[PDB]
Amino acid sequence: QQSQAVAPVYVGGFLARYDQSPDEAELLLPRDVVEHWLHVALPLNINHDDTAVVGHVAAMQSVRDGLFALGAVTSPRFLEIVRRASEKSELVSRGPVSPLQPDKVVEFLSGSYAGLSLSFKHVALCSVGRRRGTLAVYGRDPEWVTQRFPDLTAADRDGLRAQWQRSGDPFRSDSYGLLGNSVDALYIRERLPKLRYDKQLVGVTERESYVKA
Amino acid sequence: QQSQAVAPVYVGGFLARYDQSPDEAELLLPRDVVEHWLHVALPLNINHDDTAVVGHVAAMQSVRDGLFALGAVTSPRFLEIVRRASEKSELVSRGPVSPLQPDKVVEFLSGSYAGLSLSFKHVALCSVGRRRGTLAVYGRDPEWVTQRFPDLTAADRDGLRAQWQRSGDPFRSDSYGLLGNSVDALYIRERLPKLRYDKQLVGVTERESYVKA
Ligand SMILES: *CC(=O)Cn1nnc(-c2ccccc2)c1COC(=O)NCc1ccccc1
Ligand SMILES: *CC(=O)Cn1nnc(-c2ccccc2)c1COC(=O)NCc1ccccc1
């Protein structure tokens, strides 16, 4: 009964795509805007709840199509909550596409928090992203996540790899609070279609990913 | 700090509509089929988990448009889980339509478990119903639920009122398991449209209900 499930999980995805006009004008975030900002690491939480910090952003890099980010989900307290819920979900028990090994925790995160949202203050794991192309790809190896993204070049991958190889438990929230933001996710209009769309956009598929959408 | 929130909640809705052909042929359940069955009360649980019994069905009655049911959510352990999660959800904090008093718990249940599903073995509270018209209406008074359903007649309401006026905590599941079936609900195709549809069908609206869809 070795628990090699509550070990770190990495997540990567585009925080913003330079080929996609927002739905609202307020989401517009251009290349020049973003690169000025790339100039003390910044945290990773759930649905913008500062009480629900689960890890940190390990590397961001602006590339041709947008702003890529790759975080680490390190919080023991959070990963353990995730582990207990995934034992209880039918979507997880159906497992990934045959070739991929079953990873109950990586799948659960893949299902629940399928999007990325940049507010830099911090990065959040949403149910979906508000901005298109914000697909969140979870995995046990930092190099595994990055390689799902075709638009990323070898040289791109090397800029990231330099960063992710460059104080207690930061998760003060709990099962009841994640339960709380789960029903909120149910009422996001066209959640799946939006997600199926980001999948086609950044080039990821489920026969190469734990993406559940 | 009086907790008049973890008190009983009632839920009513059509288990099956006699004017709606199923999507699959296997859901067909006709009037004659149902009335033979009306001939020891039957339990009410969450997503067909027998470990997650939250109460019981207090009255069923076949009427012109279908099979109406009205249950009671009595489980202290479950209602308390629901109370803690609703404090943590943005949809609940936005409250019902102005006239309706805020009821964090009744709203949370309204959002999470918006559908009814009959498997009689037992009735389940789903995210959505598989059968159309299975809209689950939650409320603090048994008579309040019934009166949201226009198709129900006075005489219909009197048949029910006779039944709902006619052993420990039955919830052995917990926060982690409801968390588990929450992400499963996210991947039900056209969840909202299906729900907005049942709303129009059985005649309920949100300006008269805690329905969040
Ligand atoms: C990642 C975020 O910034 C949070 N978020 N993700 N998707 C949405 C959203 C909500 C409505 C319509 C489209 C997208 C959000 C917004 O979060 C909020 O501040 N509002 C809370 C809320 C969310 C869903 C339903 C009702 C209220
Ligand atoms: C009330 C129920 O009987 C459970 N339920 N509610 N909606 C669905 C459903 C699932 C897929 C497509 C349409 C409707 C279900 C079915 O529950 C299951 O047995 N399958 C588990 C599951 C649910 C959602 C997504 C993936 C797997």
Measured in angstroms, how far is the CA atom of residue B24 from the centroid of ligand 1? 33
Q: Distance between CA atoms of B179 and A112, rounded to whole angstroms? A: 10
Task: Identify the residue whose tokens are 């219909």.
Answer: B156
In terms of CA atoms, which chain A residue is nearest residue B182? Answer: A182
Active site (annotated) includes residue A21: no
Which positions in chain B touch A127 (Cβ < 8 Å)? 186
Amino acid at B195: L
Are residues A45 and A109 in contact, defined by beta-carbon separation less than 8 angstroms? no
Query: DSSP assignment, residue B135?
Result: B
Resolution of the structure in the document, Å: 2.7
Q: Tally C-beta pairs within 8 A across A and B.
A: 108
Q: What's the total number of domains in chain A?
A: 1
Q: Distance between CA atoms of A6 and B121, rounded to whole angstroms? A: 38
Token pair listed for A64: 């041709």
Q: Distance between CA atoms of A123 and A118, rounded to whole angstroms? A: 5
Concatenating the DSSP letter of every residue in chain A gives ---TTSS-EEEEEEEEETT---SSGGG---HHHHHHHT--PPEEEETTEEEEEEEEEEEEEE-SSEEEEEEEE--HHHHHHHHHHHTT-HHHHT-S-TTSPP-HHHHHHHHHT-EEEE----EEEESS-SSTT-B-EEESSHHHHHHT-TTS-HHHHHHHHHHTT-----B---HHHHHHHHHHHHTSTTHHHHHHHHHHHHT--TTSS----
The ligand 2 atom nearest the CA atom of B127: 6
Q: Is the dihedral of CA B60, B61, B67, B69 positive or negative?
A: negative
Helices (H), B40-153: 76-86, 90-93, 104-112, 142-147
User: Which of A176, A172, A180, A107 is CA-nearest to residue A137?
Assistant: A107
Q: Distance between CA atoms of A49 and A64, rounded to whole angstroms? A: 31
Residues with Cβ within 6 A of ligand 1? Answer: A 47-48, 117, 124, 126, 128, 130, 184, 187-188; B 90-91
User: What's the domain range around A50?
Assistant: 1-213
Token pair listed for A143: 């190099």
Min distance B126 CA to chain A CA atoms (Å): 12
For A197, residues 6+ apart whose C-beta sits below 8 A from its C-beta are A132
Task: Identify the residue whose tokens are 């398991």.
Answer: B177
* Phi and psi at residue A138, to the nearest 5°: -105, 150
Q: Distance between CA atoms of A164 and A72, rounded to whole angstroms? A: 9
> How was it solved?
X-ray
Query: How many CA atoms lie within 13 Å of B32's alpha carbon, on the beta-carbon side?
Result: 0
> Which of B127, B184, B192, B195 maximizes ligand 2 atoms within 8 Å of its Cβ, making it the mutation to test the pocket?
B184
**Out of B108, B184, B189, closest to residue A89 by CB:** B184
Residues of B belonging to the active site: 48, 117, 122
B162-to-A191, B121, B143, B155 alpha-carbon distances in Å: 43, 22, 11, 11
Cross-strand bridge partners of residue B10? B72, B139
The ligand 2 atom nearest the CA atom of B115: 1
Tell me, rounded to whole angstroms, the distance of Cα A179 from its chain centroid: 19
Measured in angstroms, how far is the CA atom of residue B30 from the centroid of ligand 2? 22
Strands B123-126 and B115-118: antiparallel
**Out of B89, B175, B178, closest to residue A181 by CB:** B89
| Inter-chain touch A212–B176, beta carbons under 8 Å | no
User: Which of A85, A128, A127, A124 is CA-nearest to residue A104?
Assistant: A85
Helix, coil or strand: residue B196: helix
Residues with Cβ within 6 A of ligand 2? Answer: A 90-91; B 47-48, 117, 124, 126, 128, 130, 184, 187-188
Work out the burial of residue B4: count CB atoms within 10 Å of its CB; fewer than 13 is exposed, 13-18 middle, 19 or more buried: exposed
Token pair listed for B76: 């202290």
